Symmetry: D2
Subunit: 254 residues, 4 copies
């Protein structure tokens, strides 16, 4: 399947991060990987995590997506360091924790814009710069949640950033299609991760999946990873602009 | 139908503005109205336009939705001036002209955020402040475009702002529902307005409607205005979180 | 609003029928009406119900939509009897009760086809014959349920029939658009009616609305009736091919 | 990882070498699966035997099944059981309507045209699933083929559009019902491809070009491209995925 393919994975914080599910799958399929992190506070973290994978050597780059400069210099560095790439997995979002609770109508302007900034626009420059490393096409995948298509009870501002992300995926598919670059999203069902703790009611969400979703069980990081392997490889060559729900069928019921 | 109801209408620039179609319809149905504008450069403009309507007196307020302060002071002023209101029609959007062309992947961070700011978040504070003037419920309506649900060819950043606006409507419906405030959107088809001139290829868009759309003709401001009257009145009491296409059936075909 | 307009209303069984909410609304707006029923077992029923409305005289026609002949002769008779019409409200569906429970995978071929036949195809001949009584355009509205967009837990075959109904509305809107005939659907939220008793778990459905729906309450026949008045009148002239949820916003949350 | 040895799938609706189900067949066959083929007519039986020389099945597995007949679907799948043991998936690639319903005013379509289309293109999935379930003790995966015309009114698809809308719901309702038995039900919304049935759909040429001109990838897809997504849907790569409708259509479904 995937020898000699190269992918940049963005947004591993620890062993439970969705991007680490993706990482493990692609690593198993023999790909080489490039990891980006926000903070040093998870850098030495990552080095430990990497002992678990079989990279011939480490590729770790600090990228805070709030900074145009870091994304540009980051991707230029990846260029000089590994050569051309075949894909990017975007696993990045954020919002202020007090926005992710209380009345959505109460959310501040800066809260709103901050969420859009990190969870949605980041995909955009990321794509633009990644494009530079993809002469003969490639594949970009971002992670969303159902809360981007429907109002969910504690997701508020992040819901609005997901709706924004989803459209961003469509508009980038259209724009980067002629360069043979496919842009897709995976709408994951709830998984227990570090960021999951910011979302209120997350426990009762977890249980509604088990009770009402068709498969009657929750998904996990490895499951999201296997769909990312599909989206990033040539198995999905006909596929762009799409939003694939890895959520035990929850999106289909009501 | 609508005597003694009061509605704020936001975003009339001239006689061709969509919000002026809404204005005319509600004015005919005997409502009293409150108008908000961005610039003095369209204030004396508005006074002329109002001569066409039958308001017993003028209610005009400068509100730039980029400024928290102006929205708050604006709606407090309305409170003191007219008393409680029954609805708000939001007809506001903006993006940088050079973002509305060229590759979407080339758009700047500030372009992106500016568009989200005005076209999407503004609904949020608007709602929050309007809620203060709506003790026993009411109805809020914003205007969107199909470009929010699908990638269209020159809409780019505004597309991503519309996707965001539509989710904003959903999240606001959920939050304000218990206070008996309904939040809905109208996805208008292309209409020749002042802002329409920013959107590239607008002519061929206009014709695709005439050619491919079920009704085989374009809509107009008054036709948007008539649905607005429905969304804002008790006729739609069961209806919230909804997106009603006033677009000659274009949304339904492919 | 609606003096001298004429509409055919199809599928009143008793005072709790959705079509009777529509009836009451349009009758109040001063329209004249034409009623169609399946069984004599609800004919004298209807005569009683009509005492509640202010029709200058009775217009009652037996139409079983399973029979091509009855729909044709029915609508020809209406023509000779009242002249040309302005709309049709379709409120008809049926499936075998043992299909509306048990595994959906167990449903019989005849069960499936019967449900499609009455709940979906009926709209088609109805439109075709109606069109004959609509020289200068008009408006057709059918009734659907969310179960047509998502798998709901006891709806089974009727869900597949609604998905079918929804697409039939779209394809008719496209076909009858040039003759200025608008085709639309209303996706009602659960209401306690005679047919409602066939759908299992209906009670817990009713309560999920009150609990999780934005408006935090159930809708009723008169509420559906007021949206029908909008779809059928010139207020919705720009509107066709559309599905308007009258369901307290339940369709927008998840 | 590696992939699909010793998996067994029933492929339904190969008419000739251009049939979509033959793209699926070629992909799965390449991934080392064993296959079972079902056909409507003898008129395409000896057809199939020829096509199979192209694949590497250790032996032939061919079963006549007309989905209009409850009996043939039941006896067909019981025969598959006795013949090859338990299966892992089913690829459904079957639809039909009367040719004169695929043109003209949709409003003019006959009752029987309507019901016939539902019957073959939609309901068939249901009994197929019901019977297939009997050969899937520890779960499996069912995939059916649709078209965008199921979601939006397209200009010549008429009655088939209403059958696809019905097909898509059927997948959702089956996912819900068969989920607890570990059986996933999904669809692939293919973009236009030149096949035998394609010739019944009017305007098919200008459809083909709108894809090349307006679709993000600016080119048409093919059977092998549909086949590779089917491989994903049928394998454990998609374990988290049911009730879903995956567009293999160069991104056309996302633009407007
Ligand atoms: N967990 C779920 O059930 C779930 C469900 C649906 C969608 N998702 C999506 O999956 C993605 C990641 O979620 P997760 O569960 O993997 O959570 P996670 O383990 O907390 O990963 C979040 C990552 O975001 C990074 N990050 C946040 N802001 C950043 C910025 N400005 N620049 C660079 N990196 C930044 C974090 O680094 P730091 O730790 O240093 O902040 C962390 O690596 C997000 O897009 C999220 O919305 C998760
Ligand atoms: N025209 C179409 O075919 C079409 C189609 C779909 C949706 N829409 C939507 O319709 C709405 C209105 O557009 P229109 O076509 O009627 O154009 P328009 O006549 O130019 O009206 C747009 C209004 O938005 C205002 N605006 C921009 N920034 C503002 C701010 N910061 N504060 C207050 N007002 C601000 C403009 O004010 P100033 O000019 O005074 O600065 C103007 O009054 C928008 O939401 C647009 O997305 C239009
Ligand atoms: N009740 C709800 O909560 C709900 C929610 C969403 C959507 N809906 C929809 O709203 C519509 C109206 O249903 P309802 O709730 O008002 O039920 P209802 O009061 O019992 O009305 C159903 C009507 O359909 C008629 N019908 C069934 N098969 C027919 C046939 N072959 N020919 C002519 N008429 C036939 C019945 O006729 P006779 O009884 O006179 O024989 C009856 O008048 C239905 O399409 C239903 O799917 C209902
Ligand atoms: N081609 C496209 O661009 C396109 C696009 C979207 C969706 N699709 C879908 O693709 C699927 C497959 O058709 P195709 O276009 O690939 O070419 P095809 O092989 O010509 O498809 C027709 C298949 O249907 C089978 N069939 C019809 N009725 C049957 C019955 N009652 N019992 C058993 N088999 C029956 C036919 O078998 P016999 O003819 O041998 O009897 C034939 O093999 C269809 O479901 C279609 O809706 C195609
Ligand atoms: O998108 C998500 C959806 C779910 Cl159900 C759970 C976690 C998610 O991820 C986040 C949620 C909130 C914040 Cl502030 C940051 C992140 Cl990464
Ligand atoms: O959203 C729109 C969609 C269309 Cl088809 C036509 C006009 C539109 O309205 C705008 C477009 C661009 C900017 Cl900057 C501002 C506005 Cl109000
Ligand atoms: O569509 C419906 C949805 C709901 Cl919640 C309740 C009733 C409905 O309508 C019916 C459902 C099944 C049958 Cl046999 C007949 C009818 Cl009239
Ligand atoms: O549905 C389709 C859509 C397209 Cl664009 C091309 C082929 C299709 O397939 C069919 C269409 C009509 C009939 Cl009667 C039978 C089949 Cl197999």
């Amino acid at each position: 399947n995937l020898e000699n393919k190269t992918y940049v994975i963005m947004g591993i914080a620890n062993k439970r991060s969705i991007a680490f599910g993706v990482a493990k799958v692609l690593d198993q399929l023999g790909a080489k990987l490039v990891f980006t992190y926000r903070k040093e506070r998870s850098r030495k973290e990552l080095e430990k995590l990497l002992e678990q994978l079989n990279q011939p050597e480490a590729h770790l780059y600090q990228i805070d997506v709030q900074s145009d400069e870091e994304v540009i210099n980051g991707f230029e560095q990846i260029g000089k360091d590994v050569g051309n790439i075949d894909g990017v997995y975007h696993s990045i979002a954020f919002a202020n924790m007090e926005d992710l609770r209380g009345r959505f109508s109460e959310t501040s302007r800066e809260g709103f814009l901050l969420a859009q900034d990190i969870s949605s626009y980041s995909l955009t420059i990321v794509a633009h710069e990644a494009k530079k490393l993809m002469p003969e096409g490639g594949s970009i995948v971002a992670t969303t949640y159902l809360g981007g298509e429907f109002a969910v009870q504690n997701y508020n501002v992040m819901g609005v950033a997901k709706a924004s992300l989803e459209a961003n995926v469509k508009y980038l598919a259209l724009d980067l299609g002629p360069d043979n670059i496919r842009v897709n999203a995976i709408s994951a069902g709830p998984i227990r991760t570090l960021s999951a703790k910011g979302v209120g009611g997350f426990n009762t969400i977890l249980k509604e999946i088990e009770e009402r979703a068709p498969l009657k069980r929750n998904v996990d990081q490895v499951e999201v990873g296997k769909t990312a392997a599909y989206l990033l490889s040539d198995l999905s060559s006909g596929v762009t602009g799409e939003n694939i729900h890895v959520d035990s069928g929850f999106h289909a019921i009501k």
